[PDB]
Design a protein around this nucleic acid. Structure first.
Ligand SMILES: [Cl-]
Ligand SMILES: [Cl-]
Ligand SMILES: [Mg+2]
Ligand SMILES: [Mg+2]
Ligand SMILES: [Mg+2]
Ligand SMILES: [Mg+2]
Ligand SMILES: [Mg+2]
Ligand SMILES: [Mg+2]
Ligand SMILES: [Mg+2]
Ligand SMILES: [Mg+2]
Ligand SMILES: [Mg+2]
Ligand SMILES: [Mg+2]
Ligand SMILES: [Mg+2]
Ligand SMILES: [Mg+2]
Ligand SMILES: [Mg+2]
Ligand SMILES: [Mg+2]
Ligand SMILES: [Mg+2]
Ligand SMILES: [Mg+2]
Ligand SMILES: [Mg+2]
Ligand SMILES: [Mg+2]
Ligand SMILES: [Mg+2]
Ligand SMILES: [Mg+2]
Ligand SMILES: [Mg+2]
Ligand SMILES: [Mg+2]
Lengths: 385, 61, 133
RNA sequence: GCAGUCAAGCGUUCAUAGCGACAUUGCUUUUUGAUUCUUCGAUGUCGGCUCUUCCUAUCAUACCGAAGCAGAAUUCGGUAAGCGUUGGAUUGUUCACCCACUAAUAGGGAACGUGAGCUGGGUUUAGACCGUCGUGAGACAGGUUAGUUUUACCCUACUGAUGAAUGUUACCGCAAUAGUAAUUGAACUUAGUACGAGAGGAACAGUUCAUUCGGAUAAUUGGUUUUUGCGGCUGUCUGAUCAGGCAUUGCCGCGAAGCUACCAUCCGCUGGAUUAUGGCUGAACGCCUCUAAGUCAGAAUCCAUGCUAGAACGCGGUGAUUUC
RNA sequence: AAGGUAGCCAAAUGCCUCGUCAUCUAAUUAGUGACGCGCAUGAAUGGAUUAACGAGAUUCCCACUGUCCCUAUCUA
RNA sequence: GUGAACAGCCUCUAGUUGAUAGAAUAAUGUAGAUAAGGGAAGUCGGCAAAAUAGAUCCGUAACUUCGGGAUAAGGAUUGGC
């Protein structure tokens, strides 16, 4: 018979299965539509999530109660040192989908990228790309031959880039290699752009700008095996329940004589691929610029790193991106930032954001001081000094 | 922005930090953290708590 | 008859809660039986916050105000809530005032502080309120 | 229980806006009977709780046709099950009946879904009481009170997790197929305008928030304490002091990190093809007709874009490939 | 053979029945107080009333709370 | 020793140190716990849990077989020197 009362279903059936992601680096399954009448540029960037903090700004929103008044918002900081271009790839349209035709690599590769090709780097002879480098030892006819093939046949061009993991406070020492699609210009222009940027660095400010909506792609934090109560949010059973109460009481009717796929079950929680869209950039930070955490109103000389450093991450010594709100993934995890797939004009975008203050108090406790100078001025001299 | 002062300890309160309490007599109290708020609720005298600004002023520290 | 909208405030007064009477209508407490504009979800109790209009019955006070259903407006909330300027605040008690469906107050004076959100939404409450927040 | 045909009449006039007598044709298996085919070397028996999916005879939401449709409100009908359909008092209740919120509080199926999922209030063992009946033992589809709810480690299904063999190994990719998601309301303005004698009183565009749901996240606020981190307190023990043991975490205050909450914050995309319906051109039928050929616009519908998984017997690119 | 007296009651005894009125609640098939042609109350098959007592059966109120709104966290 | 106490808690004499172990800390359990705002809206039903608690002083209703009800209800105080 029909259920006594109606209620919405628990959970979303479009995020199935709730299994572990294949790789710790989330895949980019879509790129913005190419506009050939624009200069060649990257469509995404790679970075590492450092932590969160707080900012204060004025609200520019006519018709709102808090119009022209200060608001407090949470932001996420992503450490983004420049990436290095080390190759290009051409794709050909086929009735069976896109197919990669040829890959061309740069003449010299640093040990960061080479570590990605080894599981036992300390024991290896480090022979990777030794014979391939000989293709450059000649005039370069072999390299030029493959570049002409990409120009002649390919319809989609992507560049192989890797992060400079040594510039972060992480201990991995092995770089992350990924493909980024090039938008703008003809196929020949894309190949020429990739060729000139071999062994060069591309900075994050050349990809993104201020007040721009971007998408974050990452793997969420893992929690292992989880019961149905927290994995799916089902109602807890009464206290009187025998054999346990953090369960689903009825998992199916007599017919069909099977457990259905749409019934909540215990299993892995977390470590899934997610794509979150419409995150506004609040600041594009400069690594070599002192007073990263300074605004036109605060005027104090302080970097973006809070006192004591970001918890479990460290200090920010490179360029960074400040993103409004929260982002999937935990600290120290590699994340991919991608441009939007459509032109958003909901007046939530197109708003000019000007920060007034950036919080730099310690996140390791109930921090009270923004800078060491403030602590000394408030407390005076101590026995230690 | 504007920096507030803790009503119990005299510590500076930056935006978003602590809680604000309104008493029955419409008097506003501000606390930088839950430590001073808890001590305020326990009817503790700030002048007898050694690490407060009021204590240091009273004893000329 | 709300004069505008209200940003969301944490709910702290579900159905069955009893709050003090903040006006001079003769009632002493208000017993909440419903919340105007509440949604529907299985097993979820309707709940009210500062500035909401509720349906209430007087449990203690003048006998002429007892044993009947009347609208009321919450003016103080003990549950902490966050304003859009980043401040978490709360009052010492929960209080309300008797009103008609149009928003006019049955009494003529309000004792104690009144939340800023309630005053902006209901002009009649603001007129009879002495100190806001 | 639900739906048709006919049309005497109702409807100020007027059969069919909305209804409709006397008759008559069906559909349904969410009622109850009729029957006794299956089960008495046993298929756990009422209701509620929990959870998934399906049906449409559609309560609400989207788009339309009709009216005895001026406006507002309402009524009849079409395409439509995409998306929702609640909180309580009394009762074991199904049912029923009121209070209240709401866009709305529509009806049903899945062994009258669901007891190795729960619960055990009711019915339906043994104790006991009352009324009527019986000489009596006892009876009562009458009332009342107390009454043990067992087992999964197997197979399959489902949820997650490994993995032999495709020269070896490593990195970067393709996308067959399967899944898929958002939802509804209010205020301001339009506007005291259209409409109307008046009383009354809209709508499209625009703006700001909210409801239900979903996916993440921990800067902040709150919760949690074996950080047994610091301090305090009682009894006892180490001669006193210092510093400690024991009291199954002794107790109390604060308490970082981690985890976590509409009790916290952030985010939830836009193109095509259609249904109903309204049209164009235009015959059949010299006229006329949205239809027959052809064709335009069109719904919360459908397919894609996007999002999740990646065939462990689907596939491509690229690096290095061993001498005792 | 005599035709239910004194009392008591929709009571653990009333079928009709969720009886009627009042009270209690925003709302009560519950509770209590009344009414009685009572299917089928009733006098040691004992009637009516009773202070104290009860791991007996019921209704309401105050205090209290993770029973619940709505779940979260810690230890063995 | 504490205390009203053969209560609970700690110690002396005497007696044991026996109950398969090691590593890890998922879900679900069993046992022990804590929770913001609300306070029985949960449920057949306040089931379970929480609250109360020693002692001294003050104060104590209806009813009653005059014996009770009674620790009724309701308040204050408590260390060390
Ligand atoms: Cl879903
Ligand atoms: Cl557990
Ligand atoms: Mg969640
Ligand atoms: Mg049990
Ligand atoms: Mg922290
Ligand atoms: Mg036969
Ligand atoms: Mg069976
Ligand atoms: Mg059996
Ligand atoms: Mg059944
Ligand atoms: Mg069973
Ligand atoms: Mg079963
Ligand atoms: Mg079974
Ligand atoms: Mg029973
Ligand atoms: Mg029996
Ligand atoms: Mg049992
Ligand atoms: Mg494969
Ligand atoms: Mg009687
Ligand atoms: Mg009676
Ligand atoms: Mg006699
Ligand atoms: Mg609590
Ligand atoms: Mg509390
Ligand atoms: Mg109840
Ligand atoms: Mg209930
Ligand atoms: Mg108990």
């Amino acid at each position: 018979s029909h259920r006594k009362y109606e209620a919405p279903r628990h959970g979303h059936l479009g995020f199935l299965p709730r299994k572990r992601a294949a790789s710790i680096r989330a895949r980019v399954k879509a790129f913005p539509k190419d506009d050939r009448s624009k200069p060649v540029a990257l469509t995404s960037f790679l970075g590492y999530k450092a932590g969160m903090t707080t900012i204060v700004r004025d609200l520019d929103r006519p018709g709102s109660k808090f119009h022209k008044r200060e608001v407090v918002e949470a932001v996420t900081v992503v450490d983004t040192p420049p990436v290095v271009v080390v190759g290009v790839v051409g794709y050909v349209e086929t009735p069976r989908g896109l197919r990669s035709l040829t890959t061309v690599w740069a003449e010299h590769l640093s040990d960061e990228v080479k570590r990605r090709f080894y599981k036992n780097w300390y024991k290896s002879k480090k022979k990777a790309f030794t014979k391939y480098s000989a293709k450059y030892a000649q005039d370069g006819a072999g390299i030029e031959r493959e570049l002409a093939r990409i120009k002649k046949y390919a319809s989609v061009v992507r560049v192989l880039v890797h992060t400079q993991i040594r510039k972060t406070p992480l201990a991995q020492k092995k770089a992350h290699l990924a493909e980024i699609q090039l938008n703008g210009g003809s196929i020949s222009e894309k190949v020429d752009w990739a060729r000139e940027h071999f062994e060069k660095t591309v900075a994050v400010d050349s990809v993104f700008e201020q007040n721009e909506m971007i998408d974050a792609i990452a793997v969420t934090k893992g929690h292992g095996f989880e019961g149905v109560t927290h994995r799916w949010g089902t109602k807890k059973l009464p206290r009187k329940t025998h054999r346990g109460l953090r369960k689903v009481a009825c998992i199916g009717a007599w017919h069909p004589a099977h457990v259905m796929w749409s019934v909540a079950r215990a299993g892995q929680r977390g470590y899934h691929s997610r794509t979150s869209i419409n995150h506004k950039i609040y600041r594009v930070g400069k690594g070599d610029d002192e007073a990263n955490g300074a605004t036109s109103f605060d005027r104090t000389k302080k970097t973006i790193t809070p006192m004591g450093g970001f918890v479990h991450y460290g200090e920010i010594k490179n360029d960074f991106i400040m993103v409004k709100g929260c982002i999937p993934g935990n600290r120290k995890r590699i994340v991919t930032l991608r441009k939007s797939l459509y032109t958003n004009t909901s007046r939530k975008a197109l708003e000019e954001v000007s920060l007034k203050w950036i919080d730099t108090a310690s996140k390791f406790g109930k921090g009270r001081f923004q800078t060491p100078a403030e602590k000394h001025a408030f407390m005076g001299t101590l026995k230690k000094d | 922005m504007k920096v507030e002062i803790d009503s119990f300890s005299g510590a500076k309160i930056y935006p978003g930090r602590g809680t604000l309490f309104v008493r029955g007599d419409s008097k506003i109290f501000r606390f930088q953290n839950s430590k001073s708020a808890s001590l305020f609720k326990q009817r503790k005298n700030p002048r007898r708590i050694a690490w407060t600004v009021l204590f240091r002023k009273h004893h000329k520290k | 008859g709300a004069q505008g909208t209200k940003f969301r405030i944490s709910l702290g007064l579900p159905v069955g809660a009893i709050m003090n009477c903040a006006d001079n209508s003769g009632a002493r407490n208000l017993y909440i039986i419903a919340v105007k504009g509440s949604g529907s979800r299985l097993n979820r109790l309707p709940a009210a916050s500062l500035g909401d209009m509720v349906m209430a019955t007087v449990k203690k006070g003048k006998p002429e105000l007892r044993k009947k259903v009347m609208p009321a407006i919450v003016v103080r909330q003990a549950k902490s809530w966050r304003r859009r300027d980043g401040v978490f605040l709360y009052f010492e008690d929960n209080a309300g005032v008797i009103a008609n469906p149009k928003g006019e107050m049955k009494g003529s004076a309000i004792t104690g502080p009144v939340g800023k959100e309630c005053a902006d939404l209901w002009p009649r409450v603001a007129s009879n309120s002495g100190v806001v927040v």
